[PDB]
Each structure stands twice: as C-alpha cells, then as structure tokens.
Design a protein around this ligand. Sequence first.
Ligand SMILES: [Zn+2]
Length: 36
Amino acid sequence: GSSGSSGKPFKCSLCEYATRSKSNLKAHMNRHSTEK
Ligand SMILES: [Zn+2]
C-alpha cells in the first residue's frame, strides 16, 4: 500500500534497512564496513 504507511524512526540512509529500535540498527550499520 501507498497510503498513510507509517514509516520508521531509524532508516539506514545507506540501504532500505529500518528498525523501530535503535539498538538493532546500530548492529546493522556495522555490516556497512566490510566488503562495503
Ligand atoms: Zn544499511
């Protein structure tokens, strides 16, 4: 759907990775270090 689709608080500017918890994203961002 493309109507009132509540997004997310933290959305990685690198990829389409997003999570409601900052603690989670913090771990994902790390992946953006090796072979990237
Ligand atoms: Zn990312």
